[PDB]
Ligand binder design. Structure first.
Ligand SMILES: [Ca+2]
Length: 63
């Protein structure tokens, strides 16, 4: 249930997230929508902004 964005952070939608990254970046939208839908725990079309920041923080980690 209540597990994601427990930081108390805002929420954006999948389409707006893909759109934002589609216009503020030029990465393959396939990944954009897939990642948003993967972060979309409820599969509702809405994704926590926390998820974006945490996924970037996690992707930021070099290996
Ligand atoms: Ca959701």
């Amino acid at each position: 249930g209540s597990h994601m964005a427990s930081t108390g952070e805002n929420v954006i939608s999948v389409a707006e997230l893909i759109n934002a990254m589609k216009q503020v970046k030029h990465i393959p939208e396939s990944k954009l929508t897939s990642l948003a839908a993967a972060l979309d725990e409820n599969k509702d079309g809405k994704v926590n902004i926390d998820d974006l920041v945490k996924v970037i923080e996690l992707v930021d980690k070099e290996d």
